[PDB]
Structure formats: structure tokens, C-alpha cells
Amino acid sequence: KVFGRCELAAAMKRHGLDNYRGYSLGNWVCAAKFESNFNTQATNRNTDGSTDYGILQINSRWWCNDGRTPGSRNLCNIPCSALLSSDITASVNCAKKIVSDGNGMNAWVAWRNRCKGTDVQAWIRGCRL
């Protein structure tokens, strides 16, 4: 599923991401835009052999099991395919663990390079929340 900007903002807000660990909703919408272009089915392979899955591009080296990343962990206790669903619940629940790991949203490279320090409120402007 390819979300609209305000549709995703509302789903993220309903799942408790607004101000989760101090990160306002606009940060999460901005991260999703640049990680996946709002597409729940996005996948990208990394040079180490791990793969990133879903709207927030969660990586199989640490967070989910895809059966093809040797020596990896599955800290969210989910198959990576669960992160590609049109229902974002699994992605949001796993993202909450990632952002609590100690590095905040810096774990998302696109957030660090394209959202951090910008006017992220713009990503929710005009939405009925």
C-alpha cells in the first residue's frame, strides 16, 4: 500500500508515535517519506547481505528474521515479511523498540540526513489529526 501523507500521519498518531521518546509526528512522517516513499512494500538490499523492509526500512541484521541474513538477530521477534503489510502495526511496534535503543532516530540514515534539524512540522501541515 502507498499511503498518503495525512493518511499515514493519522495512522501513526493512532498507533502512539506522536512524541514517542520525544519525537513529534512530523519526524516519523518525514522518515517514512525518504526511507520508503510511503510504500509499505519497499525492500532494499544492503552490501552486508541484510535487507531493509517496509515503510520504515527496518533492517534484518538486528530486528526481524528473513531466513537469509546469517548470524543476525530478530529483536522484534517477527518475520521481516510482516513489515510489508498494509497494516503498519508491526512496523510501528518494531520502530518503538529501535528508537528506544539509545541512538534515537539516528538509526534511520534518511532521517539523520534529510529530516533532522528541518521544519518537520511541515509534514503534518493541513492534516486533520
Author numbering: 1 to 129
Tell me what the authors wrote about this structure, in their words.
A crucial need to continue advancement is the efficient delivery of fragile and micrometre-sized crystals to the X-ray beam intersection. This paper presents an improved design of an all-polymer microfluidic ‘chip’ for room-temperature fixed-target serial crystallography that can be tailored to broadly meet the needs of users at either synchrotron or XFEL light sources. Diffraction data from two model proteins crystallized on-chip demonstrate that high-quality diffraction data can be obtained at ambient temperature using our device at both synchrotron and XFEL light sources.
For lysozyme the structure was refined to R work and R free values of 0.185 and 0.212, respectively, at a resolution of 1.45 Å. Compared with the previous generation of chips, the diffraction resolution for lysozyme was improved in 0.3 wt% agarose solution.
